[PDB]
Symmetry: D2
Subunit: 286 residues, 4 copies
């Protein structure tokens, strides 16, 4: 039974997790959110924002590989990547593994998250912030996208790695139908977007809202989920595509693209892709 | 609500993580000779059965568990006529197995009369009358003793489903998870038979998981491992399917759907595509 | 057992501290128009009444609360004949007041019919038949409205006991804790009357405590502050006694005991020596 | 509602406290017990041993003044004081306030507690460890008392400030009938002993055992309790005396002795003494 020091992680409002804490490395009230970096017995080091674990050493690769690789592998040649959120740098780490990437931009609203990750989460970023192909921008992603439309910027793959649509004030504007219309305006004609969408089991209304938003703007939409122990649930992802269909990729094609591009993974493979594409998402059944 | 309440179940998960679950009502508390039983209503999961603090089953998500436990095995077997279930006290496992039109005889063996009785009374959406199907026999006995007696009698089954309390926590079930017990299971299977068991959780309890896996592998030439997230448990349950002849990996979605249709099996979750996903998704392990 | 369970009440205490209390059974859950009511059995405290997550009363320790609330005031008054109780939904306050042989009329006013009804049914050791004493009248009404109507009618009482939900948490009771309300209380007291109220907790909620204290002091020349540890609440409840003539500080143990004897008052806790202790023990404050 | 980081403090087994933690200053697994020093929102800095708060900045004075002053004030001239336990040094701090004290010995089994208190709990010891009248001995108090009998050592006042009789393995031998017989052998003829005895409400059996032990060995016994918010209960104290009766002290006599000896307190006064002597201890009433 966990203790004596414990994190109470909110899950649904009607369920929470109690997680044994071994140490607290940092506590910072930023202008945007409360940040904690801590060591947990079960999950090793974690980043916590407003009481929610964002990432853990023992299971973050399940999250970041699931977020990034299906989209990157679906695109036959992703050269320009935009990441909204991803403050710990693991999303950037995964995207930069694709040898085809020439430019990766990461936009986070909160300098404190990026700085504390640089210092305390080395196994997450793994030097990605200093890759010559990477640019880290501190800005509200809403404003950044407006400015990119004005400039006529274009990306192959846009990855949204934000705080949750069911809980997060600072990210709420990025989950609307209107924002996805803007995302489409900064994609190439064969581009792909992927976002995490919370959890369809515990937060179906918020999930459905994000889904409707993506569907209104993209002809091809894939929904898939992965269990992340440290979150207490299976995260839902939504992949929106303008041309290429993730459902049409075979295990062999996935593995060949990963190999050709020099992508090493702890989890994601062609067989995983097939499973993600075929497993329906969880809903309350009664 | 950061802390669910005011009335809360503290469900152990790993020892280093637990779940706090809002309770709306308690319908029954019974200290049986074997274990502490609670039936309660939860806000998130509806009605639950709890044994020794662990949720065994919930109204909102039990179909994910019982369909995942039962159908891959039953669908792998081309003609399962005789089914044995060890555990399954709430009757949902029996419910799922009886859906296969080919089944002529289903035996369910649970050590604890109180679980079966309280389920009859309080969990109608789980058993759905399965206890009273003319094809079904409910036996109250330790499954270890029952299997020894079946060897003596020379009993044989097509499909054996083990739906017990967890291998990492449950004293009453520990003997049923050994290499030696799986040798006994093999002795009461037909030559083309299949066994399936839940094996706890490979992420939080890898040692206990590996022990069950080694046990199955020592006794069965074909072994499939698959997992499914069950919200009310707080983790993805691991299942281990052991087969003497037929390979679940060889089934196509179309073949699965055709067998389900032919046998009159209606499901809320399991389909040919789900089968494919289960067969191709690797199980979770701590990665660092 | 580091974590009490499996079923647990999470009782808020300060916001920065809460109590986790093992629950054995839930006898009733009722969402009334005013508040959420639970009656439950706890391992440590026996049966409890819970309103909006806060234990109001427990079988094992309620006598410490009700005797401390009622008897100092009743014993201070040389001849209390007419008693008004605001709140006191479980009937234990009424029980204690009626023990004084001098009492001819006791009125108990609670806003919430559901509390009184569920107490009648499930908390017999609290009311102990007090609701049906010929000297007692139970009125269902907001205490604010009742006091306004009593002013209009020119009603007068010897002792007014306020036994409400907390001043730091309770919306329904907030109007009864103001300077202005205590001015109204004074208008329905005889010239030598006394009021007593619980005032939350001066350690965890000093601001709310000080506000109630200032309110009483503005209206009453004699004010005594005392506290008693109530295990089931997680803190020492603060009481404030306001008096128009008679000083509780002037009572000797022997005089208290003589008045209790003369009036036929039997207690489990309160005595003359307890009175002396209550009058001399300073209340708790955060010291750093 | 407390969080996100929380201490789960055991109370009875059937009740525990959840306490918001702001920071952890130190975690040490000593040979004897697990030690944590932390900042709590409600109670400020705390020392925790095996999950139980031993002392908090906001309420420790209620505990230490209640433990020390009734006994010291009962004795007309306490010159030699022995303290068993008291690892944070607050007991020593309170005892040294009496101008009559010439020698105060503090005996704790655990060097780590004393060291971590020196470093992290300055408001508790307040330099008491380095008072010329003080001697700090690291030793099991059972062994120390046996050695004192052999040497024929004598004290005026013995204060036992140990971990709880209902939970603590390392202290169990010091709470027996036989140990109180030994305590009597190292007291002068007019000496006094005082000990905390856990809690008579939640742990009546353990309480009664300590009480029976004291009663078998001392003709005058006083029982009193004080609510300590950070513990979640009213601590019970038991004062054993060979000659002088704490019940016979008037408030004025208490105040005169405090004044004469130069004792300044935040809580204890003559009126408090009278209250402590007259308030019965709590028991489950049903
Ligand atoms: C830790 S990964 C999630 C990241 O998303 C960031 N985030 C939240 N809202 C926004 C926004 N509107 N624009 C950019 N980044 C955001 C948070 O600061 C966090 O670092
Ligand atoms: C609720 S489904 C799990 C069931 O397994 C049952 N069980 C546990 N151990 C054994 C055993 N050795 N034999 C049969 N049933 C068991 C428990 O009684 C429970 O009903
Ligand atoms: C449990 S005893 C405390 C009682 O105070 C009652 N109460 C709260 N606010 C008011 C009010 N304004 N008037 C009368 N009773 C009240 C609650 O219904 C509860 O029964
Ligand atoms: C913090 S005050 C309580 C102290 O009692 C000390 N203690 C516990 N058992 C013994 C013992 N047998 N002898 C001396 N000190 C002890 C502990 O190390 C702790 O520091």
């Amino acid at each position: 039974v966990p203790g004596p020091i414990t994190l109470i992680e909110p899950l649904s409002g009607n369920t929470s997790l109690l997680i044994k804490i071994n140490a607290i490395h940092s506590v910072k009230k930023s202008p945007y959110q409360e940040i904690i970096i801590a060591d947990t017995e079960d999950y090793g080091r974690v980043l916590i924002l407003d009481d929610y674990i964002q990432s853990s050493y023992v299971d973050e690769q399940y999250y970041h590989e699931s977020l990034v690789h299906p989209a990157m592998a679906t695109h036959p040649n992703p050269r320009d990547v935009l990441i909204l959120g991803g403050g710990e740098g693991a999303t950037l780490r995964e995207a930069l593994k694709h040898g085809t990437v020439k430019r990766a931009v990461m936009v986070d609203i909160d300098r404190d998250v990026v700085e504390l990750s640089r210092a305390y989460l080395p196994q997450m970023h793994q030097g990605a912030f200093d890759d010559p192909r990477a640019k880290v921008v501190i800005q509200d992603g809403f404003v950044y996208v407006e400015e990119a439309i004005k400039a006529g910027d274009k990306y192959d793959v846009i990855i949204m790695d934000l705080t949750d649509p069911y809980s997060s004030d600072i990210a709420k504007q990025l989950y609307t139908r209107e924002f996805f219309a803007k995302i489409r305006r900064i994609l190439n004609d064969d581009g792909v977007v992927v976002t995490q969408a919370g959890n369809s089991f515990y937060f179906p209304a918020e999930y459905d809202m994000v889904l409707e938003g993506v569907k209104a703007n993209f002809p091809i939409v894939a929904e898939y989920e992965v269990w992340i122990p440290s979150f207490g649930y299976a995260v839902n992802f939504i992949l929106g595509s303008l041309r290429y269909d993730p459902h049409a990729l075979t295990p062999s094609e996935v593995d060949e693209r990963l190999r050709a591009r020099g992508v090493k993974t702890a989890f994601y493979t062609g067989r995983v892709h097939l499973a993600l594409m075929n497993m329906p998402i969880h809903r309350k059944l009664r």
